[PDB]
Structure formats: C-alpha cells, structure tokens
C-alpha cells in the first residue's frame, strides 16, 4: 500500500535517547506515560534519584529535578507531578506554583497508580483500590477506598486502572504468566451497584458513542481485548454499560477477532485507546502491531506494524483522538486516523459502503458525498 493511501498518520513524537536518556531506564516502572503531553523518566545515578520530564507539547523541553522518591508520573495536561517513595510516602506538587497539592503516608503501600481523569488519581495497593481528588485542596487527606481487590488479580502485576467519565465505573488490569504465555485479568467495578466482576482481558477502556435515534446523548460502552493463554485466540469485545432507558437506541454487543500472525505466539494486547469523536478503537500489541476497529460495528479496519521493538507503555494522543506509545529503544510513537484517507480506504480497499457511511457521518469526514 502506498504511503499516501494509508488510513492512519504515523509520527515519531520524540526519540528519548536523543535527549540523553539512558536505555537502562526505558521500562514500565521507570519511564511513565499518562498522556501524550509528557514523558517522565526516573533516573538513578551514583545512588541519587532524579526525574527528567519531557514536555511533548512544548518542543520536547526537558525539566530535570532531583528527587527522593523512586516512582513518578505527570498529570495528563498540567505541570503537576506525583512522587512516591517505596509505595508509602506520597507527595503531589504543582511545579508552576511550587505548591504541594497532596502529602500523606500510607500504611499499606501503593503498588500502582494512574490518572483516571483530570481531577482524580487512582491507586492500587496489595489489597485495595483507592482514588484521590488531587485538586480538592485538602493536602493531608488520604485516598478514599473504592473497593477491595478481587482474588482474580492475586499474583498479577497491575498494569492499568481506568474509569468512565462519570467516575462510577472502573477497571483494574493485571497480568501473570500462565501456560508459558502472558494472561490478562480484569476487575470491573460498578460504584453505583458496589459490585465487582472478574473477567479475562489484557486491555480495557470506557468510552461513549452517539447512535442514530439518541440525538446528542451518548451511550456508554466498555471495550476490552484479550488473548487466551491456552488457545492463543484473540478477541475484542464491546459491551454497553448503564443503558439510559429513556434513549431509544441501545448498543448491541460486538465481538471481533484480534489477528495474531503465526510467528507471534508470545504477543498479546498491551494498550487500547478510543477516539470518541470518530468512533475508532486503536489496539496495540506488545510486539508493536496496531489494530484499528470501528466502534459502532467492531469491524477491524486495518492492521500494521508500527514498531519492531517491544512496546512497554501507551496513552491517548492528540486530545484522545489517537494513541501514543513508547518502545524499548525510547521512541515515542503516535498513530491517529487520516481524516482525508480513512473513508476512501473503507470504500475502496474494504469495499464497505455501509461502514464508509457510518464513519463519514459520525466524524464529518470527506469521501462519502457520492454515496
């Protein structure tokens, strides 16, 4: 396929090794990525920790600071850094105003954290799942218990924690070795119902879709991807949550195969992000394959290899219209749909008029005026 006909736009946002980052820190624990605004690299040199903040939105400007903690993340959009020492001491600072937003010491160590929203930080301990309203102004208030972890996440490495926009549905993802492969486990929690459900999956996200009949009111869907560690079968599922009975149109569950080539036995999904505006799911594998699916139908649009070096983390890109990731060589890579080519691609390469109409209509995209 000629490059001008690709339905995606690919960009290298930065090469971290060009900024002087050492490859020994390019790993899931040390180089963190909450959004395409920033990359935070925790460095240790002669026994002393530091953080390098790379501002991808400002020409890859690097801000370096010494720190006493051993784990650090940036906010999705603001110059707010969250630092912890050995899971127990936690401090969150606005680097602009210099002000301390949160400062507390946990009795039970935090072992994973992730921004759930612009206002809310999620914490997972050995036993518990918590959230903090970081910007509530009460500096010493500890995170609030959301729920206990489900036993299905026992013995997993926690790799993600996501929520819906209403902050009343949540998913925690962990991985473990099983049958010589990596299996994924997900705890889904409804805050309104105070109920958890254990499911199999490597990736998860909550999103919204506008359906015919429903005016401008979206319906909510949960998107999950899985590779079965016994059978090797890959599956994407999209399922409605909390249907508003006032709305005439419901989202019928969709299931789609996730393709794995024959020599990719040990590959699995590592990230999923969604463009709400365009209704496009972007699913990335550990080995660097990107898979696009249309959100309404679950149709697999496109599969391509964006990197040969393994991906270790990912985040939304371009106001959550795409996906960005970091590979083991320190390249920060981004994919979003080509607004000029996606509809022609569906029409001409997939020969799918109905799907072309769906995508064109939802996104206000060119290429479908003659249908």
């Amino acid at each position: 396929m000629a490059m001008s006909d690709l339905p995606i736009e690919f960009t290298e946002l930065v090469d971290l090794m060009s900024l002087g980052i050492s490859p020994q820190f390019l790993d899931f624990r040390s180089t963190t990525f909450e959004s395409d605004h920033f990359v935070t690299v925790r460095e240790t040199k002669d026994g002393t920790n530091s953080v390098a903040i790379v501002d991808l939105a400002k020409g890859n400007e690097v801000t370096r600071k010494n720190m006493g903690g051993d784990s650090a993340i940036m906010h999705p959009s603001q110059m707010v850094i969250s630092v912890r020492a050995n899971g127990t001491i936690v401090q969150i600072f606005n680097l602009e105003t210099k002000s301390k937003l949160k400062s507390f010491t946990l009795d039970e160590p935090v072992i994973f954290w992730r921004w759930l929203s612009e206002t809310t930080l999620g914490f997972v301990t050995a036993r518990s799942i918590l959230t903090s309203n970081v910007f509530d102004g009460n500096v010493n208030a500890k995170p609030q218990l959301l729920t206990l972890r489900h036993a299905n996440l026992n013995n997993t490495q926690i790799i993600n924690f996501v929520a819906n926009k209403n902050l009343d549905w949540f998913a925690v993802v962990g991985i473990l070795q099983e049958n010589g492969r990596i299996a994924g486990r997900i705890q889904l929690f409804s805050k309104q119902r105070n109920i958890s459900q254990a499911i199999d999956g490597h990736v998860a996200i909550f999103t919204n879709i506008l359906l015919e009949g429903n005016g401008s009111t979206p319906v909510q869907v949960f998107v999950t991807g899985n590779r079965n560690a016994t059978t090797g079968a890959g599956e994407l599922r999209i399922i409605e949550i909390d249907h508003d009975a006032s709305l005439p149109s419901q989202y019928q569950k969709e299931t789609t195969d996730i393709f794995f080539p024959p020599d990719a036995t040990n590959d699995f999904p590592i990230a999923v992000q969604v463009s709400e505006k365009y209704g496009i799911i972007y699913l990335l594998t550990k080995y660097g394959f990107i898979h696009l699916y249309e959100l309404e139908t679950g149709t697999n649009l496109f599969v391509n290899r964006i990197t040969a070096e393994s991906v270790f983390t990912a985040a939304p890109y371009n106001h959550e219209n795409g996906i960005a990731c970091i590979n083991k060589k320190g390249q920060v890579l981004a994919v979003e749909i080509s607004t000029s080519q996606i509809v022609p691609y569906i029409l001409n390469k997939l020969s799918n008029v109905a799907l072309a109409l769906i995508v064109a209509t939802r996104g206000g995209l060119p290429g479908a005026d003659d249908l």
């Binding site: 119902r193 109920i195 499911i199 949960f222 399922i239 949550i241 569950k253």
Partner: peptide, 7 residues
C-alpha cells in the same frame, strides 16, 4: 449478584 456485563 448478576454479572455486571455479559462476558
């Protein structure tokens, strides 16, 4: 309790 989702 029912499943939250059909999965």
């Amino acid at each position: 309790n029912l499943n939250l989702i059909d999965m």
